Structure formats: structure tokens, C-alpha cells
Amino acid sequence: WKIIETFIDPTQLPYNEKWEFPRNNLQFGKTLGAGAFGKVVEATAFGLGKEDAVLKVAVKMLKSTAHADEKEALMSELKIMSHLGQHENIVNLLGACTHGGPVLVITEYCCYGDLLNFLRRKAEAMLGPSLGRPLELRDLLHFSSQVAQGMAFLASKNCIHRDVAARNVLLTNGHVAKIGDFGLARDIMNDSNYIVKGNARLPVKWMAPESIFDCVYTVQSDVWSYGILLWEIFSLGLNPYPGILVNSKFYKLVKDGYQMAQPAFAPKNIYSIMQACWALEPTHRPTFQQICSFLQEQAQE
């Protein structure tokens, strides 16, 4: 992710101690996710926030394999979450522990986990009787609308996400979707969705051609990625470009205008908005506000 002012150096942002929470008032539980150098662990926080709440939270932290560069990355994430401010459809910051030990970033806990796994498990549950309630089209529209609203919020704050994907969306109480980024708490090195391109491990099947070829990241490239996310939703969590190897031919195909076919559960106008997100000319793609407008109408019927 990057925020525009040229981009802002997140290392230079301020940490405001309004967020500080005593680490001794966390009681940790199970690990929710881990990468090479970082992890997210559930905890109970005692006396968190204005209301001195006692609640289940998620805590992002470094593993013993981390060094100073990963400390700095986690601090950058903390500062950017504080800078962007709060929204219903993002993963919100609740606190941090920066004094007296390793940096802990306390966020909302989202009881249904990531959207991709949720859709995959739900599909299996829905096939189970032949082989709570089932998903309906309206649910898929609500998830889509919710992520779009989170993205419109981020875009309104000059934030470019750069890893929009169902795997970075969580579902909380009421199955409300929230966009975030697992970041260091994701094991990208062993994840088939991140491909070696140069020095970096990149989610190439989600990426706009201008991001792949010219390393340009804009809000318009996030819209491309959102189109791919829509395809994930309306396929109930198929892998994009299924069965296709990422090589120079895939790279050329997408630059030449190849698009995935309509997923099984997309109405025609949802497939059309996917296609619109995949316009080769970035300025021809919809904005997140246009997507929100459209999806709010579709979801409220």
C-alpha cells in the first residue's frame, strides 16, 4: 500500500500515543495467521478504549525471526492505520503497545475470518446434503458493496492498497466485510498466489497490466484488482485464471485484452462491471464511488 501527497514516506508519519495500551492487559489465545516474520494472534484486552471494554481483539506482532526492517514495516502499518482513520468496511485499529517490549498492533477481531475461505467453506456446506442458511445472490452483492465502500474510503484518503483480493477481506459480526492487509502475517513465500517477479513476490493474477509492465500503482489499478475480487466472489472462491501458468504468454495475453469468462453465479450486469474494471486504459475503468453507487442499488432489491 502507498498514500499520495509522489508518495508519502510512512516511516516519517507520527505515532500518536492516544492508541497506547498496556501489554500486560492482553491475554493471548490462538494464532490466527502467520508469515515468515510476523503473525496475528487472538487476545482478550482488558479495559480497551473509552468504554474500558473487555473484548476479543486481534494482535499483529513480529516473530523471533524478524529483524529491524520488519519492525519498521509493522510500525509503518500502525502509523498508516491511525492516519487513514476509521470506517465500517476496513479492519480498524483499536490500540498498540510500543513501550516496554515488542511492538503489538491491536485490531478488531473478525469472527468469520477471511472472505475467500468463507466462500469456499460455505459452497461445500451448501453441497453437503446431496453429498446457518445457504448463501443467496443478495449476500454476494452485499459483500461486494461492502468491500467497494471500504475501497472508496481508502481511495478518498489517497491510499492505494496494492493487494486487493478476497484473501485480504475479513467478515465480522453480521457477515459484514472489511478490507485490510495481512501483510507480514501472511506466508507469501510458500503461497501459490504470489509469483516471483524480479526481487518481489507479487499477486500477479490480481494485478493491472500497467502494474506488472511499468510498476505503476494507482487507485485505478486497485479497481482492476477489485474486478478480480468480484470474480472470486461470484465464483464462490475459484482461483483466477484457473489452470493457467504465469509466464510470458500469460503476461502478453492480459496486456492484449484477455479476460476471464463470466463466473457461474454472476448476473450479467455484475460480469459487465468486472469487465469494466478490466479496461486496458486505466482512466476508462469505473471509480470506486461508481461501483458503490451501482452495487448499493443492486444489493438493495
Residue 122 interacts, among ligand A7O, Mg ion, none and using kind-specific CB cut-offs from 5 to 8 Å, with none
Which residues, other chains included, contact 284 with Cβ-Cβ below 8 Å and sequence gap of 6+? 276
DSSP string for residues in 195-218: EEETTEEE-GGGS-HHHHHH----
What pairing do the DSSP bridges indicate for beta strands 113-114 and 169-172? antiparallel
Separation of alpha carbons 107 and 282, rounded Å? 33
Known catalytic residues are 163
Comparing CB distances to ligand A7O, the nearer of 180 and 209 is 180
Which residues, other chains included, contact 258 with Cβ-Cβ below 8 Å and sequence gap of 6+? none
Residue written as grid cell 482488558: 46
* Residue in 52, 45, 47 with CA at minimum distance from that of residue 106: 45
Comparing CB distances to ligand A7O, the nearer of 182 and 278 is 182
Write out the binding residues for ligand A7O, residues 134-193 only, by CB under 6 A.
154, 159, 161, 168, 170, 180-182
Residue 52 interacts, among Mg ion, ligand A7O, none and using kind-specific CB cut-offs from 5 to 8 Å, with Mg ion
Taking the complex as a whole, the smallest distance from the CB of residue 49 to Mg ion amounts, in Å, to 7
Which residues, other chains included, contact 233 with Cβ-Cβ below 8 Å and sequence gap of 6+? 115, 119, 140, 143, 144, 166
Residue 77 interacts, among Mg ion, ligand A7O, none and using kind-specific CB cut-offs from 5 to 8 Å, with ligand A7O
- Interacting residue with ligand A7O among 19, 23, 45, 60 (CB under 6 A): 60
Task: List, in sequence order, every beta strand (DSSP E) within 90-234.
Answer: 93-97, 104-108, 113-114, 159-160, 169-172, 176-179, 195-197, 200-202
**Sheet containing 93-97, strands listed edge to edge, beginning at the edge strand earlier in sequence:** 26-34, 38-48, 53-62, 104-108, 93-97
Separation of alpha carbons 223 and 206, rounded Å? 10
Residue 91 interacts, among Mg ion, ligand A7O, none and using kind-specific CB cut-offs from 5 to 8 Å, with ligand A7O
Taking the complex as a whole, the smallest distance from the CB of residue 94 to Mg ion amounts, in Å, to 13
- Interacting residue with Mg ion among 14, 18, 30, 52 (CB under 5 A): 52
152: phi then psi, degrees, rounded to nearest 5: -60, -35
Total of chain residues touching Mg ion, rule CB under 5 A: 2
Residue 237 interacts, among Mg ion, ligand A7O, none and using kind-specific CB cut-offs from 5 to 8 Å, with none
Total of chain residues touching ligand A7O, rule CB under 6 A: 24
What binding mask, one character per residue, do residues 71-100 give for ligand A7O by CB under 6 A, x or -? ------x--xx--------xx---------
* Residue in 88, 231, 206 with CA at minimum distance from that of residue 152: 88
Taking the complex as a whole, the smallest distance from the CB of residue 48 to Mg ion amounts, in Å, to 8
Write out the binding residues for ligand A7O, residues 203-222 only, by CB under 6 A.
none
Comparing CB distances to ligand A7O, the nearer of 59 and 273 is 59
**Is 170 marked within a binding site?**
no
Residues that bind ligand A7O (CB under 6 A): 1, 32-33, 40, 58, 60, 77, 80-81, 90-91, 107, 109-110, 112-113, 154, 159, 161, 168, 170, 180-182
The contact set with Mg ion (CB under 5 A) reads 47, 52
Q: Which residues are annotated as a binding site?
A: 32-40, 60
